[PDB]
Design an enzyme around this catalytic site. Structure first.
Site: not given
Ligand code: 0HT
Length: 330
Positions: A199, A35
């Site tokens: 991009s 990931d």
């Molecule tokens: C440890 C935190 C990581 C960095 C978490 N990352 C993510 O959510 C990134 N992707 C998350 C994963 O790549 C997911 N799409 C894969 C599946 C298999 C679980 C997004 C932002 C592109 C995050 O930012 N979570 C946000 C929640 C969020 C994120 C994006 C949009 C909306 C809400 C948070 O609150 O931190 C815990």
């Protein structure tokens, strides 16, 4: 040292890709979802609520002689998809494709989300974003890449996802055999801890390229391509019948329809995703509406370069001091 491992999609729509990982001593092999937009190494385990384990392979920290509690340590994550995982933490030897990392933080779930529980093929996640994002408390942990880095021939890993097929994850080297022409490296912003890049524009099928900065993340952990409302309208406007739907919550198209390709600019170079990549098949079985692969980012906050986009290029995550993202046609 280097490592290469085969990544294989988990279904016919390539909704996600899974890579075998050896954890423990002796070795327990789990299939993890690599990931690059997350910073946590976590796995279903021996502690996971038995009401939330359904066909997954579990990591039994009991049966590893290299395994030890990180006493006091604890994790919790939220994903963009609304995914939720949490538990305790252990330290173990983890090998990926023969690149062995000793004393890696392996995050043992006590609790997992519905999403993960209804997913038989995946045994956990291996985060390859930057270490700042790793969730583990009170002492935060480094990723597997962070652990491998100095041991590597080159502080890089490549990602070469296949369309309805296996691909490869390489750590420590670039296969000059795996792409065509030139790799175009572009600047990465580490500030939010993502593989975060800008991009240089887009084109819709054979239309004319619009030069416009689309700031976004490369994330192999995200299935589709997430782009601004504006960009997304220009694309679907070209497929007769395509509509944005309230109930389904995204752009759909008559499955009998024909997807023009999508082109994204990385610097002076251009990457074509074929229209076939953006067909994600019928919204429900039997449906003649099909679900599109390019969705608006408006509701998330960030543009995601997901599998749809990455799987059309040979990607290089340069984990150098001055991190750089490389793209090449394949
Ligand atoms: C440890 C935190 C990581 C960095 C978490 N990352 C993510 O959510 C990134 N992707 C998350 C994963 O790549 C997911 N799409 C894969 C599946 C298999 C679980 C997004 C932002 C592109 C995050 O930012 N979570 C946000 C929640 C969020 C994120 C994006 C949009 C909306 C809400 C948070 O609150 O931190 C815990």
């Amino acid at each position: 040292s280097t490592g290469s491992a085969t990544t294989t999609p988990i279904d016919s729509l390539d909704d996600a890709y899974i890579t075998p990982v050896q954890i423990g001593t002796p070795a327990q092999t789990l299939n993890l979802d690599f990931d690059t937009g997350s910073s946590d190494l976590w796995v279903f385990s021996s502690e996971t609520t038995a009401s939330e384990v359904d066909g997954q392979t579990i990591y039994t920290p009991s049966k590893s002689t290299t395994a030890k509690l990180l006493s006091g340590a604890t994790w919790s994550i939220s994903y963009g998809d609304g995914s939720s995982s949490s538990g305790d933490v252990y330290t173990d030897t983890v090998s990926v494709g023969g690149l062995t990392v000793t004393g890696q933080a392996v995050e043992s779930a006590k609790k997992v989300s519905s999403s993960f529980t209804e997913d038989s093929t995946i045994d956990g996640l291996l985060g390859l974003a930057f270490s700042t994002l790793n969730t583990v408390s009170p002492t935060q942990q480094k990723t597997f890449f962070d652990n491998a880095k100095a041991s590597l021939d080159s502080p890089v890993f490549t990602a070469d996802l296949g369309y309805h097929a296996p691909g490869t994850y390489n750590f420590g080297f670039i296969d000059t055999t795996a792409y065509t022409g030139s790799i175009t490296y572009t600047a990465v912003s580490t500030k939010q801890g993502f593989w975060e890049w800008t991009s240089t524009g887009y084109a819709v099928g054979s239309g004319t390229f619009k030069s416009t900065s689309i700031d976004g993340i490369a994330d192999t952990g995200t299935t589709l391509l997430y782009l601004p409302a504006t960009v997304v309208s220009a694309y679907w406007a070209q497929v007769s019948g395509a509509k944005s739907s309230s109930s389904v919550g995204g752009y759909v198209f008559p499955c009998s329809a024909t997807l023009p390709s999508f082109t994204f600019g990385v610097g002076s170079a251009r990457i074509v995703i074929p229209g076939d990549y953006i067909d994600f098949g019928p919204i429900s079985t039997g449906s003649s509406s099909c679900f599109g692969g390019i969705q608006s980012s408006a509701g998330i906050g960030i543009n995601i370069f997901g599998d749809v986009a990455l799987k059309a290029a040979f990607v290089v995550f340069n984990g150098a001091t001055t991190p750089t993202l490389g793209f090449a046609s394949k």
